[PDB]
């Protein structure tokens, strides 16, 4: 069902090849707990690239300054896809009238004849008023050589979903270097540290008029001791950016562990990269725009957003020029959205065009939507494992991308 090298996510939050893996290992399910793998198929066929669609970028090549798609998979023709279409009617409600014909036209399932002899089932586009077969979305599965019986519109409507990590690890406070009154502020300074910092030392770069936010670095400074070094010494903060990954070879690095572990702490650590270079806005719903010119951070703060269910897309952009000059060439613009998921993070941001009032009510992490492409590739090895037939038969990619058995 996956092409050879197709990382999945382990139920303890880890990540291996879909080739490395063998009966017993769990893999993580959609609500956060294990799953079980009994069997590993193989086998050889046409295989296909699933990709997010997007407007823009990726041309083929082994540097990964153009900005990357990170949903996306390749599978067999076999594969079966978790999808959602919305329902939909048009030009009456279930069944009005008027006079001298008119047309309903409305999504609804159906049997299509495939091609090849099969007869499948799926969503299709009727004509005025019929019966026979036809919540406010379908719930469905198809078939990737199957996505090309599909009628023009009910093709762009359908999407995949992926699921938030809801799986918490602790290697973040297993790292001392107590948990109530502390981590908040280590992790906040790390975030404000990929944000503004100095790559060779504990030193950031708050912003004077911003009174709150100097207000900020030094109340926390002084929770963790140290105080007003950065406005390399055995210096925990300093200790900690080398220690927890937060420099990926000389250069600064958003870890991966930080998908998988305590909620709070991947929610604080957002915070501080948005006090430091992000930006909010409420035009069109709420939104939290992070800049970087680093690759690393880029694609390792994707992961982490929507590790927490937020809405994420990636953007390049020009960086800066000193009378004409100084700095050249790229950056990266990465939005979030999600409503009370994001309310959430900037609940705890200091910057005063930043902060933003908690959720009213307690919330959901929901599994958020994507629209992709399918490419017919072909022939080759594919492999695949498989859940408990008692099971939900599903698990997430590491990519968090919800996949099928």
């Known amino acids: 069902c996956f092409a050879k090298g197709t990382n999945v996510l382990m139920a303890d939050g880890s990540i291996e090849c879909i080739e490395n893996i063998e009966v017993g290992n769990k893999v993580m399910g959609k609500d956060g707990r294990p799953r079980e793998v009994i069997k590993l198929p193989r086998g050889r066929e046409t295989m296909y690239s699933v990709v997010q669609k997007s407007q823009h970028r990726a041309h083929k090549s082994d540097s990964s300054r153009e900005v990357p798609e990170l949903l996306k998979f390749t599978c067999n023709a076999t594969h079966e896809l978790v999808v959602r279409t919305p329902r939909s009617v048009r030009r009456l409600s279930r069944t009005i009238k008027g006079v001298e014909y008119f047309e309903v036209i409305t999504f609804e399932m159906g049997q299509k004849k495939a091609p090849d002899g099969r007869i499948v089932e799926l969503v299709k586009e009727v004509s005025k008023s ?19 019986l599909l009628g023009s519109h009910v093709r762009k409507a359908t999407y995949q979903t992926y699921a938030p990590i809801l799986y918490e690890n602790d290697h ?4 001392m270097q107590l948990t109530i009154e502390g981590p908040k502020v280590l992790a906040y300074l790390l975030g404000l540290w990929i944000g503004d910092g100095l790559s060779d030392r504990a030193t950031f770069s708050v912003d004077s008029r911003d009174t709150s936010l100097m207000e900020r670095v030094t109340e926390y400074a002084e929770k963790l001791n140290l105080c007003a070094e950065y406005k390399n010494t055995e210096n925990p903060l300093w200790d900690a950016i080398v220690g927890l990954g937060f420099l990926k070879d000389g250069v600064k690095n958003i870890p991966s562990f930080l998908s998988t572990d305590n909620i709070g702490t991947r929610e604080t650590f957002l915070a501080g990269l948005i006090d430091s270079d992000g930006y909010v806005t409420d035009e069109h719903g709420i939104k939290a725009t992070i800049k970087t010119i680093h690759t690393s951070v880029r694609d390792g703060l994707v992961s982490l957003a ?8 990636v953007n390049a952009e020009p960086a800066k020029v000193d009378m004409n000059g100084t700095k050249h060439k790229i950056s990266y613009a990465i939005y979030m959205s999600g409503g009370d998921v994001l309310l959430n993070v900037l609940s705890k941001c200091a910057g005063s065009k930043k902060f933003r009032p908690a959720p009213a009510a307690a919330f959901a992490r929901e599994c958020r939507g994507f629209y992709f492409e399918l ?27 919800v996949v099928h058995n």
């Not at 019929?130 to 090309?148: C, G, H, N, Q, V």
């Not at 973040?172 to 790292?175: A, E, L, Q, W």
């Not at 490419?375 to 991308?401: C, M, P, R």
């Open 375 to 401: 490419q017919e590739l072909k022939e080759d090895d594919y492999y695949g494992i498989t859940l408990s037939d008692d099971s939900d038969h599903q698990f997430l990619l590491a990519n968090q991308v």
């Open 306 to 313: 929507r590790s927490l269910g937020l809405v994420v897309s």
């Open 130 to 148: 019929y019966p026979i077969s036809e919540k406010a979305y379908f719930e469905w599965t198809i078939e990737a050589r199957d996505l090309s």
């Open 172 to 175: 973040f406070f297993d790292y």
